[PDB]
């Protein structure tokens, strides 16, 4: 049981959310990957939207205490779209940009203006 | 200007959000990447949280209409946490897991059980 | 994990119901098999009934839209009845009749008269 | 007049239900196969749904008394779907799973979690 | 899936409890091993307690009817206590005494005086 | 006076509970094994239930303070159930599973999924 390069185990299991714990996760150190979903609700003429949330939670030393660093990856896919097209777009266009230096600079410096070449 | 392997141009500029337009963005088709920041508010004694949001928006055919697929990547870093440690954690743990088949399955099928290998 | 000749995966888990997803299940297309149980409640003197429900759900083209076709197979077994006798009856009498052309005709044409051979 | 491998005869005949009796059916032993239909009601813009129910009823010794074991096979087919596609899906995908060991284990043990290969 | 020398299967999966059924478990007989947990609650300054419960249930002939024999095993480990110290305490001091003839006499006859050697 | 491999002495003697103290028990540290019983009460037609309880209490360093780790083992045996069957069930089915690594994982980490072998 692995997510990416990190081996995990099932920690908690609800109907629409499964929380997995990393090897370091314990009662005082948080190391968790949550997979949560919101299933499409057919309302009116709209068929709904599937929401997929991937949560990374890690404990970090903050001065004397511990702080929780959280990274969320959320996708909103309306019902009726071709899944293969969305997967290809996510692989070719979303993934390379989401794991680039832009994400790190935005996280640790608040950089929203890109530069330059 | 590039975001990963995609060339973009500044499209909308605000104080805390910049929207960049991809090569396919026009009046009819959406192809955008947005960078948004929520700077820490060090109220009282707590030093606040830096929130970095990266938004990917793409229009897709859905029957006769068009539907927006949105992918969100948000980092919540409390103030005082070492930036280098957070960047190392994001690069070695979050980035490989957020670009695996697990993310694609969760987004396009709502799969929250990553069995079993 | 297999149901007959179809490979399935755990999709949704509840206390008394489990939904498995087929290879064609995604945000746009439904391909699911659900197993539900109603355990006996031995109120007063009656030992109750065990209710086992099997649900097959598949999306189909219907003009411009999609329509859900659902097949239900429910067994109501009162408590105290020999399990082996019930299984023999289901295998020898119920199963051959529930997979004949009679079931197909009833489902797709509403035929309730099985004349004449 | 046969249903599956069981020879039956017409026992009762209404507009939307025909009850057939097996060779053993009598005034004290129940051995019946009912075919019931609910015809589509064209209401609003919805063209309705054809419901087809196949009921197997059998009397079984339960201690000192006799209990009724009932198996229901219900199909809900919306108007406008291709009937050949539904029949092919039912033959190749519904029937093998509905007459497997999964159904027997669900009926006689309440097993909703599948295992393992 | 083994708990000791017993081959079990998942029977009910809840966020804080998983019930495993043995070979002799069915609708009318009970053969179950239930794992239960109460995760620590960081209330005030106390980090909480980790509560783990392992339940054994079996049906037994009791004259005319069938009675349920239940063996419970609950551990209370406060957060912050070294886990390795607790595990060697249980292995060497709790487990050998909890599986001796003292438990058998206490369970069947209520013997609380273990005289004398 | 032995409970397993531990040499204990009588520390408290009441009608339905005897507390024995280990070699490390004193005024400021807890090292105790308590045997408790609830004798059957012939209430109405029910012959009652014998309840047995084995309690293990130890003190452990918890940061600055000393925390109490408690392991409980409770058995409920209805009156009329054959004692030898219960004893062989505990010896063969309950004891081997109650002293395995599953107990340690449940007590220290709250693991309720014993995947997979």
XYZ file of C-alpha atoms in Angstrom:
702
model
C 0.000 0.000 0.000
C 1.772 3.107 -1.278
C 0.907 6.630 -2.391
C 3.601 7.986 -4.673
C 6.891 6.922 -3.097
C 5.501 6.799 0.465
C 4.257 3.519 1.899
C 1.072 3.990 3.928
C -1.452 1.922 5.858
C -5.185 2.342 6.360
C -5.720 4.521 9.435
C -9.404 5.465 9.283
C -12.188 4.500 6.883
C -15.507 6.312 6.436
C -18.006 6.171 3.582
C -16.473 8.977 1.495
C -13.078 9.532 3.155
C -10.140 7.220 3.837
C -7.235 8.497 5.938
C -3.911 6.686 5.504
C -0.978 7.031 7.894
C 2.679 7.194 6.934
C 5.358 5.171 8.717
C 6.117 8.056 11.097
C 2.494 8.775 12.046
C 1.789 8.374 15.758
C -0.188 9.936 18.610
C 1.993 13.075 18.675
C 3.380 13.295 15.107
C 0.882 13.748 12.274
C 1.837 12.156 8.940
C -1.377 11.530 7.017
C -2.742 11.360 3.480
C -6.519 11.716 3.262
C -8.546 10.765 0.190
C -11.980 12.398 0.317
C -14.735 12.536 -2.277
C -17.987 14.409 -2.771
C -20.181 12.397 -5.113
C -22.184 14.203 -7.823
C -25.640 15.293 -6.689
C -28.163 15.442 -9.543
C -30.072 18.684 -8.974
C -32.373 20.073 -11.644
C -30.966 19.837 -15.157
C -27.401 19.765 -13.803
C -26.025 16.251 -13.360
C -23.688 17.403 -10.579
C -19.953 17.503 -10.028
C -17.534 14.988 -8.538
C -15.136 16.578 -6.046
C -11.892 14.820 -5.199
C -9.712 16.053 -2.331
C -6.225 14.758 -1.542
C -4.933 16.054 1.797
C -1.332 15.883 3.022
C -0.861 16.671 6.716
C 2.539 16.796 8.415
C 3.737 17.959 11.826
C 6.662 20.381 11.866
C 8.717 22.013 14.638
C 7.526 25.612 15.011
C 9.786 27.233 17.583
C 8.946 25.292 20.728
C 5.594 23.848 19.620
C 4.447 21.791 16.629
C 2.518 23.208 13.677
C 0.467 21.346 11.079
C 1.448 21.912 7.448
C -1.375 20.947 5.085
C -1.334 20.623 1.294
C -4.668 20.147 -0.481
C -5.149 18.955 -4.059
C -8.789 19.357 -5.100
C -10.375 18.519 -8.453
C -13.903 19.423 -9.579
C -15.059 17.330 -12.544
C -18.607 17.911 -13.861
C -20.625 14.867 -14.878
C -20.701 14.343 -18.637
C -17.069 15.149 -19.424
C -14.817 12.533 -20.996
C -12.618 11.104 -18.246
C -9.745 10.240 -20.601
C -9.506 13.846 -21.806
C -9.440 15.144 -18.226
C -6.767 12.607 -17.268
C -4.624 13.593 -20.260
C -4.995 17.295 -19.429
C -4.115 16.674 -15.773
C -1.055 14.610 -16.708
C 0.300 16.924 -19.416
C -0.628 20.385 -18.110
C -1.634 20.317 -14.433
C 0.947 17.943 -12.958
C 4.155 19.546 -14.355
C 3.073 23.006 -13.206
C 1.769 21.924 -9.805
C 5.088 20.281 -8.837
C 7.389 23.033 -10.119
C 9.349 25.760 -8.353
C 6.311 28.040 -8.726
C 4.396 26.053 -6.100
C 7.301 26.148 -3.640
C 7.864 29.877 -4.168
C 4.157 30.595 -3.682
C 4.074 28.463 -0.526
C 7.191 29.815 1.197
C 7.397 33.357 -0.230
C 3.946 34.400 -1.472
C 5.197 34.878 -5.033
C 2.299 35.324 -7.464
C 4.085 37.324 -10.194
C 6.054 34.996 -12.463
C 9.361 35.807 -14.150
C 10.803 36.083 -16.663
C 11.786 33.801 -19.541
C 6.610 33.138 -18.863
C 6.115 29.422 -18.248
C 4.280 27.244 -15.730
C 5.873 23.825 -15.934
C 6.064 23.150 -19.674
C 3.213 25.484 -20.711
C 3.714 29.039 -21.966
C 1.413 31.610 -20.356
C 0.838 35.359 -20.385
C -0.371 37.716 -17.670
C -4.144 37.986 -18.071
C -5.496 39.537 -14.863
C -3.584 41.282 -12.075
C -4.918 42.011 -8.595
C -3.269 42.699 -5.238
C -3.190 39.056 -4.105
C -4.079 37.101 -7.262
C -2.627 36.859 -10.767
C -4.406 34.927 -13.524
C -2.319 33.733 -16.484
C -3.865 32.611 -19.774
C -2.742 29.579 -21.743
C -2.409 29.340 -25.525
C -5.985 28.030 -25.901
C -7.691 30.742 -23.832
C -10.149 32.959 -25.708
C -13.744 34.213 -25.449
C -15.079 30.671 -25.915
C -12.463 28.365 -24.345
C -10.999 28.591 -20.844
C -7.325 27.736 -20.295
C -6.080 29.523 -17.187
C -3.705 29.150 -14.253
C -4.262 31.391 -11.228
C -1.824 32.128 -8.396
C -3.373 33.451 -5.184
C -1.829 34.302 -1.825
C -3.279 34.854 1.640
C -0.548 36.535 3.649
C -0.332 35.816 7.390
C -2.217 38.091 9.769
C -0.209 38.058 13.007
C -3.181 38.890 15.209
C -2.809 38.735 18.979
C 0.057 36.331 19.639
C -0.406 33.819 16.806
C 1.761 34.657 13.801
C -0.847 33.472 11.290
C -0.665 31.195 8.275
C 0.643 31.702 4.748
C -1.862 30.267 2.258
C -0.778 29.613 -1.313
C -3.402 28.565 -3.870
C -2.697 27.392 -7.421
C -5.720 27.053 -9.711
C -5.966 25.240 -13.054
C -9.086 25.842 -15.144
C -9.928 24.205 -18.466
C -13.119 24.030 -20.509
C -14.186 20.619 -21.811
C -16.997 19.440 -24.102
C -20.014 18.155 -22.148
C -22.791 17.079 -24.474
C -23.804 20.200 -26.365
C -22.425 22.556 -23.704
C -19.026 23.259 -22.137
C -18.018 22.419 -18.573
C -15.209 23.848 -16.453
C -12.755 21.407 -14.875
C -10.824 23.003 -12.007
C -7.833 21.583 -10.131
C -6.792 23.306 -6.903
C -3.480 22.958 -5.059
C -3.361 24.806 -1.733
C -0.536 24.949 0.809
C -1.109 26.104 4.404
C 2.216 26.913 6.087
C 2.104 28.284 9.662
C 4.540 31.105 10.370
C 7.735 29.987 12.117
C 8.025 26.640 10.343
C 11.319 26.257 8.495
C 10.752 26.972 4.806
C 13.525 24.609 3.685
C 12.033 21.683 5.614
C 8.586 22.377 4.143
C 10.028 22.554 0.623
C 11.903 19.276 1.123
C 8.727 17.610 2.413
C 6.694 18.925 -0.530
C 9.299 17.822 -3.080
C 10.007 14.359 -1.658
C 6.570 13.419 -0.288
C 3.713 15.578 -1.586
C 4.763 16.092 -5.209
C 5.277 12.398 -6.152
C 1.994 11.417 -4.496
C -0.041 14.264 -5.990
C 1.019 13.349 -9.552
C 0.482 9.583 -9.351
C -2.372 7.495 -10.732
C -4.007 7.876 -7.306
C -4.779 11.536 -8.021
C -6.121 10.738 -11.493
C -8.341 7.951 -10.152
C -9.668 10.146 -7.343
C -10.393 13.034 -9.711
C -12.011 11.121 -12.580
C -13.564 8.131 -10.762
C -13.821 9.088 -7.086
C -11.535 6.255 -5.972
C -10.530 6.612 -2.308
C -9.239 3.039 -1.815
C -5.749 2.600 -3.300
C -5.503 -1.178 -3.101
C -3.414 -3.209 -2.882
C 0.190 -3.336 -4.108
C -12.032 -9.280 -6.477
C -14.521 -10.749 -8.943
C -18.303 -11.011 -9.229
C -18.967 -13.820 -11.665
C -16.652 -13.031 -14.579
C -16.293 -9.291 -13.853
C -13.363 -7.793 -11.954
C -14.455 -5.190 -9.402
C -12.846 -2.996 -6.764
C -13.945 -1.692 -3.380
C -15.649 1.658 -3.992
C -17.912 2.483 -1.036
C -18.079 0.798 2.371
C -20.828 1.153 4.966
C -21.937 -0.948 7.937
C -24.474 -3.032 5.993
C -23.776 -2.133 2.350
C -20.722 -2.381 0.099
C -20.598 -0.905 -3.412
C -18.024 -2.257 -5.879
C -17.140 -0.450 -9.108
C -16.666 -2.137 -12.463
C -13.938 -1.333 -14.988
C -16.185 1.203 -16.766
C -17.202 3.218 -13.691
C -16.142 6.871 -13.635
C -17.636 10.340 -13.097
C -19.668 9.994 -16.304
C -20.560 6.284 -16.584
C -22.103 4.042 -13.928
C -20.978 0.415 -13.614
C -21.606 -0.792 -10.069
C -22.556 -3.881 -8.080
C -23.856 -3.367 -4.542
C -24.201 -5.961 -1.777
C -26.609 -5.033 1.012
C -27.739 -6.966 4.070
C -30.604 -6.588 6.530
C -29.722 -8.763 9.499
C -32.575 -10.423 11.413
C -33.999 -8.681 14.461
C -35.397 -11.250 16.899
C -38.151 -9.098 18.362
C -40.641 -10.754 20.695
C -40.759 -14.436 19.763
C -40.161 -14.201 16.003
C -36.506 -14.652 15.062
C -36.857 -12.303 12.085
C -35.764 -12.525 8.472
C -32.367 -12.122 6.834
C -32.585 -9.986 3.686
C -29.802 -10.131 1.117
C -29.898 -7.651 -1.774
C -27.697 -7.627 -4.880
C -27.819 -4.491 -7.038
C -26.512 -4.118 -10.595
C -26.408 -0.580 -11.985
C -25.320 0.465 -15.471
C -25.667 3.680 -17.455
C -26.987 3.442 -21.013
C -27.444 5.946 -23.853
C -31.016 7.285 -23.948
C -31.376 9.754 -26.786
C -29.099 12.633 -25.858
C -28.997 11.767 -22.145
C -27.982 8.761 -20.043
C -30.379 6.441 -18.224
C -29.668 4.117 -15.307
C -30.685 0.468 -15.684
C -30.888 -1.340 -12.336
C -31.340 -5.063 -11.677
C -32.193 -6.185 -8.141
C -31.894 -9.702 -6.713
C -33.245 -10.012 -3.168
C -33.451 -13.109 -0.969
C -35.696 -13.170 2.117
C -34.737 -16.114 4.342
C -36.601 -16.556 7.658
C -34.435 -17.559 10.606
C -34.480 -21.285 11.399
C -34.766 -22.488 7.808
C -31.933 -24.827 6.850
C -29.291 -22.910 4.907
C -28.262 -25.951 2.851
C -31.823 -26.635 1.687
C -32.274 -22.978 0.718
C -28.985 -22.982 -1.201
C -29.955 -26.175 -3.035
C -33.341 -24.681 -3.946
C -31.729 -21.455 -5.177
C -29.109 -23.304 -7.233
C -31.453 -25.877 -8.786
C -34.691 -23.896 -9.192
C -34.192 -20.134 -8.837
C -30.869 -19.658 -10.631
C -31.756 -21.435 -13.925
C -35.096 -19.619 -14.111
C -33.682 -16.189 -13.263
C -31.146 -16.390 -16.122
C -33.457 -17.690 -18.858
C -35.029 -15.819 -21.762
C -38.052 -15.318 -19.487
C -36.149 -12.801 -17.353
C -34.819 -10.969 -20.414
C -38.290 -10.776 -21.965
C -39.848 -9.544 -18.720
C -37.162 -6.891 -18.254
C -36.962 -5.531 -21.806
C -40.506 -6.164 -23.102
C -42.743 -6.642 -20.056
C -43.722 -10.180 -21.068
C -45.558 -12.004 -18.264
C -47.011 -14.837 -20.400
C -44.449 -17.559 -21.185
C -46.332 -19.438 -23.880
C -46.378 -22.179 -24.871
C -43.734 -24.910 -25.054
C -44.927 -24.385 -20.032
C -41.577 -24.161 -18.254
C -39.498 -21.543 -16.456
C -35.835 -22.480 -16.497
C -35.682 -26.200 -15.733
C -38.977 -26.231 -13.790
C -42.284 -27.106 -15.426
C -45.070 -24.778 -14.293
C -48.752 -24.206 -14.988
C -50.880 -21.071 -14.970
C -52.251 -20.595 -11.451
C -53.580 -17.028 -11.418
C -53.822 -14.400 -14.151
C -54.353 -10.666 -13.643
C -53.680 -7.743 -15.970
C -50.093 -7.099 -14.824
C -49.298 -10.277 -12.858
C -49.316 -13.966 -13.746
C -48.631 -16.480 -10.970
C -47.492 -19.940 -12.083
C -47.486 -22.986 -9.813
C -44.818 -25.665 -9.710
C -45.660 -29.370 -9.647
C -45.504 -29.454 -5.835
C -47.684 -26.378 -5.262
C -50.824 -27.158 -3.274
C -53.122 -25.725 -0.599
C -50.480 -26.118 2.137
C -47.154 -26.050 0.226
C -46.244 -22.884 -1.677
C -44.206 -23.344 -4.870
C -44.856 -20.334 -7.091
C -43.178 -18.195 -9.737
C -44.831 -14.808 -10.234
C -44.202 -12.526 -13.205
C -45.290 -8.967 -12.441
C -44.880 -5.829 -14.516
C -45.316 -2.119 -13.908
C -45.797 -0.408 -17.257
C -44.116 2.958 -17.927
C -46.191 5.983 -16.955
C -45.353 8.822 -19.350
C -45.381 11.697 -16.859
C -44.029 15.143 -17.673
C -41.029 15.073 -19.985
C -39.983 11.732 -18.476
C -41.121 8.734 -20.512
C -41.319 6.544 -17.404
C -39.734 3.229 -16.537
C -40.759 -0.380 -17.131
C -40.461 -2.476 -13.964
C -40.251 -6.247 -14.228
C -40.389 -8.447 -11.124
C -39.812 -12.204 -10.954
C -40.863 -13.721 -7.626
C -39.888 -17.205 -6.442
C -41.822 -18.376 -3.380
C -41.194 -21.706 -1.660
C -42.372 -23.257 1.601
C -39.656 -24.633 3.876
C -39.686 -26.483 7.214
C -38.789 -23.988 9.948
C -38.618 -26.026 13.136
C -42.208 -27.123 13.681
C -43.860 -24.615 11.329
C -43.464 -23.656 7.660
C -41.699 -20.483 6.535
C -41.849 -18.770 3.149
C -38.535 -18.221 1.368
C -38.838 -15.542 -1.318
C -36.362 -14.517 -4.019
C -37.098 -11.367 -6.026
C -35.448 -10.386 -9.311
C -36.458 -6.848 -10.291
C -35.328 -4.852 -13.324
C -35.954 -1.140 -13.926
C -35.524 -0.208 -17.594
C -36.186 3.438 -18.554
C -38.034 4.101 -21.797
C -35.720 5.077 -24.646
C -32.856 2.684 -23.922
C -31.893 0.112 -26.538
C -33.340 -3.237 -25.477
C -30.660 -5.305 -27.233
C -27.899 -3.534 -25.295
C -29.731 -4.137 -22.010
C -30.224 -7.818 -22.856
C -26.538 -8.209 -23.739
C -25.497 -6.515 -20.486
C -27.866 -8.697 -18.448
C -26.636 -11.888 -20.126
C -22.897 -11.170 -19.951
C -22.666 -9.147 -16.731
C -25.737 -9.494 -14.496
C -26.587 -13.193 -14.826
C -23.122 -14.669 -14.037
C -22.829 -12.575 -10.876
C -26.420 -13.049 -9.729
C -26.100 -16.861 -9.813
C -22.673 -17.093 -8.165
C -21.536 -18.133 -4.703
C -21.732 -14.439 -3.767
C -25.539 -14.580 -3.817
C -25.636 -17.736 -1.686
C -23.173 -16.362 0.873
C -25.096 -13.084 1.055
C -28.383 -14.947 1.538
C -27.272 -17.483 4.155
C -24.429 -15.640 5.929
C -24.848 -11.896 5.339
C -21.503 -11.624 3.547
C -21.130 -8.217 1.890
C -17.308 -8.056 1.828
C -15.814 -9.966 -1.097
C -12.558 -11.917 -0.961
C -9.941 -12.210 -2.171
C -8.648 -12.991 -5.660
C -6.262 -12.765 7.585
C -5.312 -14.333 10.920
C -5.921 -13.369 14.545
C -3.800 -15.930 16.358
C -4.465 -19.317 14.757
C -7.935 -18.328 13.490
C -8.624 -17.487 9.847
C -11.082 -14.581 9.781
C -12.644 -12.324 7.159
C -13.891 -8.746 7.234
C -17.565 -8.681 8.213
C -18.325 -5.089 9.234
C -16.072 -2.080 8.677
C -16.694 1.050 10.760
C -14.523 4.130 11.325
C -13.571 2.922 14.821
C -14.482 -0.786 14.785
C -13.851 -3.716 12.442
C -15.635 -7.014 13.116
C -13.986 -10.184 11.820
C -15.980 -13.390 11.392
C -14.564 -16.855 11.944
C -15.311 -20.011 9.961
C -18.338 -20.850 12.143
C -20.015 -17.429 11.898
C -23.323 -17.139 10.044
C -26.816 -15.661 10.436
C -27.787 -17.902 13.381
C -24.387 -18.493 15.044
C -21.836 -16.022 16.403
C -18.095 -16.497 15.847
C -16.546 -13.029 15.775
C -13.453 -11.115 16.845
C -14.068 -7.359 16.980
C -11.288 -4.772 17.108
C -12.312 -1.423 18.585
C -10.437 1.780 19.307
C -10.907 5.198 20.885
C -8.354 7.644 19.522
C -6.753 10.184 21.875
C -8.579 13.479 22.368
C -6.261 16.407 23.129
C -8.508 17.881 25.808
C -7.025 20.904 27.549
C -3.416 20.178 28.471
C -3.918 16.403 28.667
C -2.876 14.689 25.439
C -5.544 12.038 26.013
C -5.544 8.267 26.203
C -5.396 5.571 23.538
C -8.119 2.994 24.214
C -7.957 -0.329 22.380
C -10.525 -3.098 22.756
C -10.450 -6.633 21.362
C -13.729 -8.531 21.689
C -14.290 -12.284 21.385
C -17.816 -13.634 20.935
C -19.021 -17.202 20.448
C -22.386 -18.934 20.613
C -22.639 -21.971 22.871
C -25.319 -24.593 23.565
C -27.242 -23.561 26.691
C -29.803 -26.274 27.364
C -32.496 -25.572 24.788
C -31.331 -22.168 23.522
C -27.884 -20.825 22.572
C -25.996 -18.431 24.851
C -23.250 -15.958 23.962
C -19.875 -16.132 25.725
C -17.882 -12.900 25.452
C -14.225 -12.321 26.342
C -13.049 -8.704 26.397
C -9.502 -7.328 26.305
C -9.150 -3.571 26.815
C -5.952 -1.535 27.129
C -5.631 2.087 28.272
C -2.350 3.728 27.253
C -1.978 7.456 28.033
C -0.354 9.585 25.350
C 3.331 10.267 26.031
C 4.095 6.948 27.710
C 6.910 5.175 25.885
C 5.319 2.571 23.624
C 8.267 0.160 23.753
C 8.118 0.000 27.557
C 4.404 -0.849 27.438
C 4.865 -3.585 24.835
C 7.559 -5.399 26.815
C 5.395 -5.067 29.933
C 2.408 -6.656 28.187
C 4.500 -9.392 26.565
C 6.298 -10.423 29.764
C 3.991 -9.399 32.634
C 0.419 -9.223 31.311
C 0.165 -11.888 28.589
C 1.647 -14.832 30.569
C -0.682 -14.102 33.487
C -3.747 -13.363 31.361
C -3.581 -16.772 29.625
C -2.877 -18.969 32.661
C -5.233 -21.247 34.597
C -6.168 -18.257 36.776
C -8.196 -16.786 33.910
C -9.943 -20.118 33.306
C -10.989 -20.479 36.953
C -12.027 -16.822 37.197
C -14.140 -17.019 34.029
C -15.926 -20.291 34.821
C -16.028 -20.350 38.639
C -15.189 -16.813 39.787
C -12.067 -17.865 41.695
C -10.297 -14.753 43.007
C -7.945 -16.452 45.517
C -5.028 -18.124 43.707
C -3.633 -20.123 46.615
C -0.920 -20.811 47.248
C 2.197 -21.772 45.294
C 1.744 -16.768 45.029
C 2.034 -16.510 41.241
C -0.026 -14.978 38.441
C 1.855 -16.134 35.363
C 5.571 -15.604 35.981
C 4.945 -12.780 38.483
C 5.301 -13.296 42.233
C 2.522 -11.350 43.960
C 1.217 -10.933 47.497
C -2.250 -10.186 48.827
C -2.674 -6.417 49.076
C -6.431 -5.909 49.415
C -9.127 -8.485 50.165
C -12.822 -7.677 49.717
C -15.928 -9.778 49.134
C -15.755 -9.760 45.323
C -12.300 -8.342 44.550
C -8.751 -9.264 45.561
C -5.872 -6.945 44.645
C -2.413 -8.525 44.535
C 0.725 -6.385 44.440
C 3.865 -7.054 42.440
C 7.436 -6.571 43.653
C 7.473 -2.988 42.313
C 4.294 -1.882 44.115
C 4.510 0.690 46.908
C 2.853 3.915 48.078
C 3.997 6.002 45.082
C 4.141 3.372 42.300
C 1.402 1.066 41.019
C 2.114 -2.561 40.088
C -1.085 -4.507 40.724
C -3.187 -7.391 39.441
C -6.824 -7.293 40.566
C -9.189 -10.255 40.335
C -12.849 -9.218 40.321
C -16.023 -11.246 40.032
C -19.765 -10.792 39.663
C -21.614 -13.932 40.708
C -24.751 -15.077 38.868
C -28.047 -13.607 40.052
C -31.041 -15.929 39.622
C -33.280 -13.177 38.276
C -36.636 -14.534 37.150
C -36.170 -17.520 34.853
C -32.679 -16.469 33.737
C -30.017 -18.329 35.714
C -27.661 -15.344 35.534
C -24.168 -14.757 34.219
C -20.742 -15.212 35.789
C -18.537 -12.173 35.162
C -14.781 -12.421 35.661
C -12.322 -9.535 35.489
C -8.523 -9.508 35.485
C -7.020 -6.024 35.793
C -3.341 -5.195 35.273
C -2.176 -1.768 36.430
C 1.338 -0.376 36.097
C 2.960 3.028 36.447
C 5.101 4.427 33.643
C 7.159 7.601 33.143
C 5.046 10.119 31.200
C 7.299 13.091 30.530
C 7.515 14.706 33.950
C 4.675 12.823 35.656
C 3.793 9.125 36.016
C 0.857 7.686 34.066
C -1.153 4.535 34.753
C -1.360 1.874 32.036
C -4.237 -0.560 32.580
C -5.012 -3.790 30.722
C -8.447 -5.287 31.366
C -9.602 -8.815 30.553
C -13.283 -9.553 31.179
C -15.200 -12.774 30.545
C -18.986 -13.213 30.567
C -20.172 -16.817 30.870
C -23.939 -17.463 31.038
C -25.075 -20.070 33.547
C -25.795 -23.480 32.008
C -23.159 -23.258 29.284
C -20.776 -26.204 29.501
C -17.627 -25.021 31.260
C -15.204 -27.379 29.498
C -16.257 -26.129 26.058
C -15.729 -22.520 27.157
C -12.323 -23.353 28.627
C -11.097 -25.128 25.495
C -12.466 -22.266 23.375
C -10.462 -19.760 25.426
C -7.356 -21.961 25.396
C -7.448 -22.618 21.643
C -9.211 -19.602 20.096
C -9.139 -16.641 22.496
C -5.744 -16.825 24.228
C -3.510 -17.248 21.128
C -5.176 -14.285 19.422
C -5.281 -12.115 22.542
C -1.494 -12.327 23.064
C -0.319 -11.775 19.477
C 1.165 -8.661 17.866
C -2.396 -7.579 17.023
C -2.986 -6.773 20.696
C 0.242 -4.756 20.853
C -0.599 -2.758 17.720
C -4.150 -2.112 18.938
C -2.948 -1.007 22.384
C -0.085 1.235 21.255
C -1.233 2.494 17.836
C -4.949 1.667 17.605
C -4.556 -0.617 14.583
C -7.861 -2.320 13.728
C -6.961 -3.621 10.234
C -4.777 -6.746 10.464
C -3.810 -6.957 6.802
C -3.263 -9.263 5.191
C -1.678 -12.665 5.791
